[PDB]
Write a protein that binds this ligand. Structure first.
Ligand code: HEM
Ligand code: A1A0G
Ligand code: H4B
Ligand code: ZN
Length: 416
């Protein structure tokens, strides 16, 4: 009841007691392990007033235990106050302090996030007074400008009104605030980002005038209080982009690649004391490999291993010439170098995974554990030459948390 996780590179052992506070379920049983199911039946998100208070109490007890005013009068009164409000209003409202705590700790608990060493340094923007898609557009624009900080990227989250009935729902329909468009071609192939081809088609179905190109930043599709979503284009001066060059291969610039500096996930759901925030875009900075390995070299994404290995002049006839590997490394050297030379914040997969081991040590010390999803923490290249490969990690689900949620167009009772 006090499990141990070993690092097999360093022979370090850490004792995990935090998993005992775990509440949610993982998907695994004693007879089957789902650790590699991407969106397990559990990881996806209507409530009742009865369910709501234990979740509120449980959350409030750890918040007051975090300011070391656990069980005091200030705590018991807040327990009573929210109990009463879940009677009166069948729900409740977080204090600003509670919102900032819960949001930080949802990140802290994000077992698939390798960046969490920064969890306490998160800027929380309270958009709970927002009422229109135009207001969402405004809060998001302030979020982009703030979190971008002229390339000195800063972690932030903007938290729109919580779900109430369900049919009134604030949603950012974009999967991220800044993403490149995907256009299928008349010959079947794909321009831009193939991930977003369906989303790009939705934006055009709502009137987007597509500049049918590669790195065309998509418009925000913002749904406010259940109403139909509306298009807004982020002021281009607010979307910071890094042109990708290589520090040796001067032909690399002719590849004509770029990426945006701000990774800002917008499709997920924040849970805080039973309250559900369906629109809560959050940003940090990139680990290089998300761009250089996944964005650029996934077969179903940009898929540039072909053209890079070409210009490198590589033994491409044979699978075993590791021409794909050799061109994957150059691509990631180039992403890193380009971002660093523009002073745009980026972390390489070695520095990031080291920070996470350090972060794990702190979490087992001053917290008793650190839920971690090996399948997601190990970078998608050079796995075993990074220290997280060698670190046993216990995955368990704690709250507050970020959850997945259905895409809004599969669930929105639309009315033209
Ligand atoms: C500050 C720098 C950050 C870095 C370097 C970082 C790094 C990463 C990476 C590489 C992933 C894997 C994504 C993929 O490869 O598909 C990830 C996932 C994730 N990040 Fe972090 N992140 C950062 C900040 C944040 C912030 C500020 C939040 C929330 C406020 C957050 C929440 C999450 C969540 C919830 C996931 C996983 C989603 C899931 O469960 O599937 N991250 N992060
Ligand atoms: C392949 N990248 C796609 C992707 C997917 C997801 Cl679920 C999260 C992030 C993400 C989010 C934040 C806040 C920082 C960061 N470095 N990455 C990126
Ligand atoms: C099938 C598998 O679960 C899926 O490819 C996961 C594996 N690990 C991952 N790890 C990260 N960081 N990001 C991902 O998208 C994935 N994809
Ligand atoms: Zn398992």
């Amino acid at each position: 009841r006090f499990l141990k996780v070993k690092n097999w590179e360093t022979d370090v052992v850490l004792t995990d007691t935090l998993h005992l506070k775990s509440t949610l379920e993982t998907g695994c049983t004693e007879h089957i392990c789902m650790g590699s199911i991407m969106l397990p039946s559990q990881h996806t998100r209507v409530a009742t007033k009865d369910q709501l208070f234990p979740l509120a109490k449980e959350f409030l007890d750890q918040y007051y235990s975090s300011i070391k005013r656990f069980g005091s009068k200030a705590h018991m009164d807040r327990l009573e106050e929210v109990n009463k409000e879940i009677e009166s209003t069948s729900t409740y409202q977080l204090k600003d302090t509670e919102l900032i705590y819960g949001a930080k700790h949802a990140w802290r608990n994000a077992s698939r996030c390798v960046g969490r060493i920064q969890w306490s340094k998160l800027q929380v923007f309270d958009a709970r007074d927002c009422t229109t898609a135009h207001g969402m557009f405004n809060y998001i624009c302030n979020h982009v400008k703030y979190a971008t900080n002229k390339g000195n990227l800063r972690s932030a989250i903007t938290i729109f009104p919580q779900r109430t009935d369900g049919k009134h729902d604030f949603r950012v329909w974009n999967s991220q605030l800044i993403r490149y468009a995907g256009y299928k071609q008349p010959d079947g192939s794909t321009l831009g980002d193939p991930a977003n081809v369906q989303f790009t088609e939705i934006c055009i179905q709502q009137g987007w005038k597509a500049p049918r190109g590669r790195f065309d930043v998509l418009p925000l599709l913002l749904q406010a209080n259940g109403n139909d979503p509306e298009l807004f284009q982020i002021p281009p001066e607010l979307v910071l982009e890094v042109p990708i060059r290589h520090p040796k291969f001067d032909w690399f610039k002719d590849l004509g690649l770029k990426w945006y500096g701000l990774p800002a996930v917008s499709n997920m759901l924040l849970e805080i004391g039973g309250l559900e925030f369906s629109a809560c875009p959050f940003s940090g900075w990139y680990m290089g490999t998300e761009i250089g390995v996944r964005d650029y070299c996934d077969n179903s994404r940009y898929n540039i291993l072909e053209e890079v290995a070409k210009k490198m002049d590589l033994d491409m006839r044979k699978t075993s010439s590791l021409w794909k590997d050799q061109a994957l490394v150059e691509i990631n050297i180039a992403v890193l170098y380009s971002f660093q030379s523009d002073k745009v914040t980026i972390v390489d997969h070695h520095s990031a995974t080291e920070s996470f081991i350090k972060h794990m040590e702190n979490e087992y010390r001053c917290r008793g554990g650190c839920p971690a999803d090996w399948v997601w923490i190990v970078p998608p290249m050079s796995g075993s030459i990074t220290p997280v490969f060698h670190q046993e990690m216990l995955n368990y689900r704690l709250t507050p948390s970020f959850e997945y949620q259905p895409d809004p167009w599969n669930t929105h009772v639309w009315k033209g």
